[PDB]
Amino acid sequence: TDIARHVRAKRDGCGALELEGVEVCVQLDDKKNIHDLIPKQPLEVHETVAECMILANHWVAKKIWESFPH
C-alpha cells in the first residue's frame, strides 16, 4: 500500500492522465442468462498494481532499449 501510494505520489508530481472508460460486467448463472448487469469501477488496489507494473515494464523497456538500439 505505502510503496504504491508513493510511486503514485512521484509519478503524479510528474503528472499522468488518469481517465476512465464506460465498462460494465455481466454475471451468468447456471441457466447462462442475465441475473443482472452491474457497472464496474476502478479500485484502489487496481491503481496500486497498475503503477507497480507501469514502473516495472518501464525499467524493462529502458533495459531493452539501451540493450538493443535499433
37 binds RNA (CB under 7 A): no
> Which one of 13, 15, 21, 39 is in contact with RNA (CB under 7 A)?
21
Selected range binding RNA among 7-15, 31-39, 43-51, 62-70, rule: CB under 7 A: 43-51
Which H helix or E strand runs over 52?
A: helix 44-67
For residue 64, what is its C-alpha cell?
531493452
Whole-number Å distance between alpha carbons of 25 and 34: 11
Taking CB under 7 A as the criterion, the residue among 2, 13, 14, 19 binding RNA is 19
Minimum CB distance to RNA, residue 58 (Å): 11
